[PDB]
Amino acid sequence: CPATVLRQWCNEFHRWWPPLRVVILHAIGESRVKELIDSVFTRGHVIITTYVGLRIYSKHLLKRDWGYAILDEGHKIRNPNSDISLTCKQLRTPNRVILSGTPIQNNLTELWSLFDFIFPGRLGTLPVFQNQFAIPINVGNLQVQVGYKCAVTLKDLISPYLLRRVPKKSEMVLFCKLTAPQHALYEKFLRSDELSRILQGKRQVLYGIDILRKICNHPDLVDVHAKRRSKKDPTYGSASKSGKMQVVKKLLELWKSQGHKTLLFTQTRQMLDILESFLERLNAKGAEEEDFVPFKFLRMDGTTSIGVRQSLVDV
């Protein structure tokens, strides 16, 4: 189980079934873990492990036989060929159960790799799994019917191996335009040597679409002095240059006076600096004048500690 539910997983054991003994894979539940191993198979009933902690004591875990196997992680297995398979699929037990309602999110290769852990391959090998129906599903008449049967065969083959069970919502998508300073920086980066250099193969496209998203968030994020002016230059953020501040200012102020607890969502902690300078400036403007209320934001990320979590989640 993840490290965010470690105590939780021991808790239901304690409350529902006290007769079941339990031992987490930590300093308690290099010799000390070996005395822990002493009578962890006869006396010990259930062993708990964080899915980072197996490769801390795997020397004396993967060796002996095991019974029932539970893994509460269906998005940290995904596709094959990773440390996942290295420390997981070497377990010695038919009983293999995964607890996750989102196993399929990227591709059917993840499906094959997840089916491998539970069953020894009722479908076939990875080359077999691919050559069977990988391309036909993607491309697809000339595809549908043969593809229809080749897919329903898979559905009947794996269906008795994974269970499936399922106010209102408004999805308004606004299509804003690139500003003129944005279009200039877009064309400048558009016609440059680095893009072709990435395309031919010396680099990866992952570093050329991260920088063209770096300009869409706002112009001032493709600067070389990003860290040098992120939190010590009160002009780094700015407004109306991003092409989205106006549909941010208007949309957030339509709820600020309306009193609607709203969620602002990003992906980068670097753009958090800009949206945080922006909202501090909004706070300054509101506080200087009257008939208003402080914006009162907060930012949470991996920089903070695991202890904080729920607290802010609650506040």
Partner DNA sequence: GGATTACACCCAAGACACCAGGCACGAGACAGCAAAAAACAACGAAAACGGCCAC
Q: Which pair of structure tokens corresponds to residue 230?
A: 């992120």
Cβ nearer to DNA, comparing 137 with 198: 198
Q: Is 98 helix (H, G, I), strand (E, B) or coil?
A: strand
Burial bucket for residue 301 (CB in 10 Å: 0-12, 13-18, 19+): exposed
Cβ of residue 189: shortest distance to DNA, in angstroms? 10
**Contact between 268 and DNA per CB under 7 A:** yes
**Contact between 271 and DNA per CB under 7 A:** yes
**Contact between 51 and DNA per CB under 7 A:** yes
For 130-138, which contacts have Cβ atoms below 8 Å and span 24 or more sequence positions?
A: 133/108, 134/108, 134/109, 137/108
Which positions from 228 to 267 touch DNA by CB under 7 A, shown as an x/- string? ---------------------------------------x
Identified binder of DNA from the candidate list 8, 38, 41, 56, rule CB under 7 A: 56
Q: Which pair of structure tokens corresponds to residue 187?
A: 């064309």
Among candidate residues 98, 1, 100, the one with its CA nearest the CA of residue 47: 1
Cβ of residue 52: shortest distance to DNA, in angstroms? 4
Window 170-229: residues binding DNA (CB under 7 A): 194, 197-198, 202-203, 206-207, 210-211, 214, 226
List, in order, residues 6 or more apart from 92 with CB less than 8 Å away.
65, 66
**Using CB under 7 A as the criterion, which residues of the chain lie in contact with DNA when the complex forms?**
2-4, 50-53, 56, 194, 197-198, 202-203, 206-207, 210-211, 214, 226, 267-272, 301-303, 306
